Design a protein around this ligand. Structure first.
Ligand code: K
Ligand code: K
Ligand code: K
Ligand code: K
Ligand code: K
Ligand code: K
Ligand code: K
Ligand code: K
Ligand code: MG
Ligand code: MG
Ligand code: MG
Ligand code: MG
Ligand code: MG
Ligand code: MG
Ligand code: MG
Ligand code: MG
Ligand code: MG
Ligand code: MG
Ligand code: MG
Ligand code: MG
Ligand code: MG
Ligand code: MG
Ligand code: MG
Ligand code: MG
Ligand code: MG
Ligand code: MG
Ligand code: MG
Ligand code: MG
Ligand code: MG
Ligand code: MG
Ligand code: MG
Ligand code: MG
Ligand code: MG
Ligand code: MG
Ligand code: MG
Ligand code: MG
Ligand code: MG
Ligand code: MG
Ligand code: MG
Ligand code: MG
Ligand code: MG
Ligand code: MG
Ligand code: MG
Ligand code: MG
Ligand code: MG
Ligand code: MG
Ligand code: MG
Ligand code: MG
Ligand code: MG
Ligand code: MG
Ligand code: MG
Lengths: 97, 73, 63
RNA sequence: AUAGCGUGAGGAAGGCAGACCCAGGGAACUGAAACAUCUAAGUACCUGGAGGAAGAGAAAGAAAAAUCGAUUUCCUGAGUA
RNA sequence: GAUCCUGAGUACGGCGGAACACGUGAAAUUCCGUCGGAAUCCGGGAGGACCAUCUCCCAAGGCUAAAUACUCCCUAGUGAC
RNA sequence: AAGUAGUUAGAGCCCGUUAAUGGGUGAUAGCGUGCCUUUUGUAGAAUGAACCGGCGAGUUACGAUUUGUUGCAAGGUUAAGCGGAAAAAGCGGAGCCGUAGCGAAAGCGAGUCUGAAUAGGGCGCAUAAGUAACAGGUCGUAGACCCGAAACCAGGUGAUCU
RNA sequence: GGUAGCGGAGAAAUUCCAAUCGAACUUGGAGAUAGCUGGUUCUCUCCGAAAUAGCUUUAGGGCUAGCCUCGAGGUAAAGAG
RNA sequence: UACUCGGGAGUCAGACUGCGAGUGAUAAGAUCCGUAGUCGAAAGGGAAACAGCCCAGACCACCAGUUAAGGUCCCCAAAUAU
RNA sequence: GGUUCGUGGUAGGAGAGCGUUCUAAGGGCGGUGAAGUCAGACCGGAAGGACUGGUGGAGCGCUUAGAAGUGAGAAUGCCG
RNA sequence: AUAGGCCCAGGCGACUGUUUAGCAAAAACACAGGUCUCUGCAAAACCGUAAGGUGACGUAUAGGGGCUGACGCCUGCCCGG
RNA sequence: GUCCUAAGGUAGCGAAAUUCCUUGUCGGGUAAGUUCCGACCCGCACGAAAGGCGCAACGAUCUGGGCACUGUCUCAACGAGAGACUCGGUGAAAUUAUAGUACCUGUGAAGAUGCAGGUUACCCGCGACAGGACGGAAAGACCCCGUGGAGCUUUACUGCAAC
RNA sequence: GUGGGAUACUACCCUGGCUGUAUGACCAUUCUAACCCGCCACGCUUAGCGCGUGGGGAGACAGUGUCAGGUGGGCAGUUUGACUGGGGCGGUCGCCUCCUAAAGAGUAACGGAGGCGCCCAAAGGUUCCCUCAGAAUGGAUGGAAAUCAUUCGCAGAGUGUAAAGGCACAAGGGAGCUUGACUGCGAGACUGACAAGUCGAGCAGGGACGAAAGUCGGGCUUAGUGAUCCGGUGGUUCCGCAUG
């Protein structure tokens, strides 16, 4: 309240809409994936069992924030281009679930 | 009958001679060219004198009845 | 009980990663003939809620 | 012939615990820094029915590339949509 | 599985109102009043206007404990009352 | 002999203490217009209180935010509930917060949106500490600090007065 | 004995309806609401304002800023004379 | 000292005096701005008494001293001073 | 423990404490006299705390923590 | 002891009566009288959701409402709103 | 004669329960008459059922004058009784910050018992008066304010019954 | 031949008019069996209620329900501004310009003066060119003053419009070419409670003028304007409540 002066929110406009089929994905980085011995297989179930993840919100997504040092096969719902590149460059491989 | 005025426009100078000034800074607000634009200085649509490069303000005389302002690094 | 969120504020603000609040400019409905294009290309952008106003409204849109 | 009248066999009537619930009917003060939509509120109050609980309830359902299997109550979802 | 049955003046629709968080709003769903007014198994409903497809389900009939709410009361007891 | 009534100086008189540069009284001398409230400003000829005694006003629940403390730490924590002494553990990880942001959204992602742009700029990251609980401060919903309207509405009682 | 308050009765005055009448009394919603006045209880220590701008169906109210306090910060030490 | 961030406020009736201007009547303890001061929120000494003027800022005690404004015949401390 | 600068203050901010009721624990006094009350010339920088004596005639302090119906001189306050 | 002061003139209201219990007794109300108007009887008008009633156990020489306010002489023009 | 009108006020009455100017003017009444009676008519702004004009009787009506009567008065005096006053009994109240509660002049929140400076003043009461204590009572009823309220009105707004 | 078109007659049409049929609305009159009767006779029944039975009367009207329009202070809930040398009247309320305003900025009053709520398709952009007012004379209509020649003339003019500032090395006047009165933005500054307002070099795109330099994101500058909410229009590699 501002004394009958028009409030800030009433002097500016509404914006947008909430989508109903919105998909938000659990965000995994590369730094975590150094925890595993090379040549093994990473999965959603494994990442939950290890407590890295609790909520598979609408899926998993692996982002290239950081670095890996280790060869790995990874499988998830969506990857970023850069993280795919880094995984391959370490000799890893990628599957899309 | 009477009793209305307008909001004052904060004219005059805004940086001093000897004062370093970053580019784009406003140096003298005015109506008309009460101060002409000089070196490294422009004049806006509303006659404001602003600096164009980083430098040091200097007020300088033109011929007798006129003045300018310049910016020298 | 729990605090009710101010919904007219929720529909027009937005948070950042610093916890600040983003808004849209507000002379942008119906009189654009009387507004220079320099003015409009800026009003179509966003803005940050100021500190004085944030100090007032933060507890309405804490969530 | 029915109405009506009479007799007999059953049954009810009324009360409360200023509580809890189901329905019928249903305000305004107040708030919105006036105010009329709106709110307060289906609240207070009236009335009727009850029962130890009532109401609801065994999908003409909830959902979605996967299915679950009657209702109710609690935590969350969420002060979200 | 020849045949037959499967809740009709309802189900829906129009008008007017109400309840659903949802103020007629694009307004699904449920209910009331009044007008109209279905198919009924190659049938009918719902999936938030609506259409098709898909999926799930059989209304307009009824019963149903437990978990929930309360305490005029009884017994034994408690209180950084 | 006037004097917000005491105070400071102080004789004289009278007592003798939690014994200490003590007590009670006070001729006389100096100075000095109560308390509270509200006020620019009140001794106030502004308000309130006769006096005395008792009672009598920022509190609790839930939520937000911040500070401090403690525990664990890119993790932290469980709610209902089972269990049980109206306990304590154990169980319970469903969910909540944070760890990634940007965008109306699709979506992309240490980038993203705008935009024709690889440009610049906004927000972010770079520039990494949160979380649970306690306590303090404050805010919100609730009577919310205490007292106080004239009035409004609903159910009833009343024509023994008039 | 009858007429009872969204009412009744009035040779009519706003007259009367139990010492109450421009709308009785009582009880409840109800701790109505009150930007209004009044009041708000123990001690010391440190710091210490304002009575301004702007907007306000606003003017004895409020909101932001200016002014106070507490804490933590950061240095190409920026303050003051 | 300043600035920045954050927690917490209160304030939005101001008064006189001197200086500069308005309105006013070159009146007002008027009114309205600007400026500086005091009061507010400031006791104390002086203006008889006196918010707002002059001097001047009280932590406490002391039967110590020097000073300001203002004063030195008596009330009344200090010169019946040159 | 020292040196320097300071130590008037309303609204108001910040801090440290006094005291009351109750609780837990520890440890105590109290019929050879508790709380309470009355009087005193004691103590502490303050809120406040002891001691002595009288009256009373059965419960109460201290310490460290904790929790609050926490401290009145005014409300044309309420009751007596 | 108890037991009318009278007269002249004037305004207002004809009168007797009623009225603000508890400041106004009046020139205010009512009044008889005039006038308009409505009403065919399950009258109109009124009370009440409706039933049911008053009206009225009446019937246009009656009933309701409005205005005027005894009596005398009179009551004029305007139907644009 | 002319404009406007829907049509322009008829009778009767008239400084009026209506007349501002206005104590209008003239007359009467009075020593003297803003009141009174009667007439006039520039009716600010009478007027015909918001009835006009008039009128016997009526009236705790209003108004002016007169006769009588009188302590209404000039201008007060006496008396009686009830309080008041003293004695005895009984025994409240409003009010109240504490009070050893003077006057003048001044200062002061601009009107002082209480401040200053001067002037008066022995202590305690009783009966009487009421200048002050901005005396008591009653949170001013005037005034203003409150985005307060009630009651009433209407061609304010939105509605509701009823037709 | 006329004419847009030819005439005879034939058929299919169209435009109306009348008869006849068949359908289908509105309105009126009648009937009666719904409904109604505060009419009679009888019965329940010692009943002026009610109901039933039989007549008589109205009769598809009335009444009742649902929907709809109108009238509607009969009743109701509410509204009915602020500043202000008390309130009120009068005036004012937003924006620009001067003075006040005390030589930075800012700075009040029911303080003194005026303007605005537009206009311009050239009154913009560029490139090029030049320069005003007024006076002195000389001159035919023609004059105090039209137009012309010479001289003087820093502006005594003009600057779309109020005023202030500024402008003659144009920002004043003509001409040509044009549409930068563009799109994306914008380091940085001004101002500033917030909202907003103001200036902005420069980067990119694609252009205008000009040989070029370079200027051009409206006008010499400063006013010419109004939030959200709600609607409308156009556009869109956005969403689209199981999928399309
Ligand atoms: K049941
Ligand atoms: K609906
Ligand atoms: K289904
Ligand atoms: K960027
Ligand atoms: K009573
Ligand atoms: K004792
Ligand atoms: K006359
Ligand atoms: K007196
Ligand atoms: Mg407003
Ligand atoms: Mg411009
Ligand atoms: Mg309100
Ligand atoms: Mg359906
Ligand atoms: Mg409907
Ligand atoms: Mg609803
Ligand atoms: Mg229907
Ligand atoms: Mg669907
Ligand atoms: Mg006094
Ligand atoms: Mg008093
Ligand atoms: Mg007391
Ligand atoms: Mg009764
Ligand atoms: Mg009246
Ligand atoms: Mg309530
Ligand atoms: Mg109350
Ligand atoms: Mg200090
Ligand atoms: Mg003054
Ligand atoms: Mg001054
Ligand atoms: Mg004050
Ligand atoms: Mg002083
Ligand atoms: Mg003195
Ligand atoms: Mg004082
Ligand atoms: Mg000091
Ligand atoms: Mg000395
Ligand atoms: Mg001496
Ligand atoms: Mg201090
Ligand atoms: Mg208490
Ligand atoms: Mg009479
Ligand atoms: Mg009376
Ligand atoms: Mg009387
Ligand atoms: Mg009559
Ligand atoms: Mg009837
Ligand atoms: Mg009459
Ligand atoms: Mg008289
Ligand atoms: Mg007539
Ligand atoms: Mg009489
Ligand atoms: Mg006496
Ligand atoms: Mg008062
Ligand atoms: Mg009304
Ligand atoms: Mg209301
Ligand atoms: Mg006002
Ligand atoms: Mg200046
Ligand atoms: Mg779909």
């Amino acid at each position: 309240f501002e004394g009958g002066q028009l409030p800030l929110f009433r002097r500016i406009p509404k914006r947008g809409f909430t989508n109903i089929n919105r998909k938000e994905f659990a965000i995994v980085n590369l730094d975590v994936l150094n925890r595993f011995e090379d040549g093994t297989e990473v999965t959603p179930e494994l990442l939950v069992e290890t407590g890295i993840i609790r909520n598979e919100k609408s899926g998993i997504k692996i982002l290239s924030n950081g670095n890996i040092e280790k060869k790995l096969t990874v499988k998830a719902n969506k990857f970023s281009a850069a993280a795919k590149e880094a995984i391959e460059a370490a000799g890893g491989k990628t599957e899309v679930i | 009958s009477n009793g209305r005025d307008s909001e004052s426009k904060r004219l005059g100078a805004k940086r001093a001679d000897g004062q370093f000034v970053t580019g784009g800074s406003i140096l003298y607000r005015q109506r008309g060219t009460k101060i002409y634009p000089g070196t490294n200085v422009g004049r806006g649509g509303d006659d404001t004198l602003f600096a164009k490069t980083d430098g040091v303000v200097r007020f300088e005389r033109m011929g007798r009845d006129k003045k300018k302002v310049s910016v020298y690094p | 009980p729990k605090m009710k969120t101010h919904r007219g504020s929720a529909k027009r603000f937005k948070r950042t990663g610093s916890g600040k609040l983003k808004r849209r400019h507000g002379f942008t409905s119906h009189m654009f003939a009387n507004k220079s294009q320099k003015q409009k290309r800026k009003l179509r952008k966003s803005a940050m809620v100021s500190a004085g106003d944030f100090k007032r409204i933060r507890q309405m849109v804490a969530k």
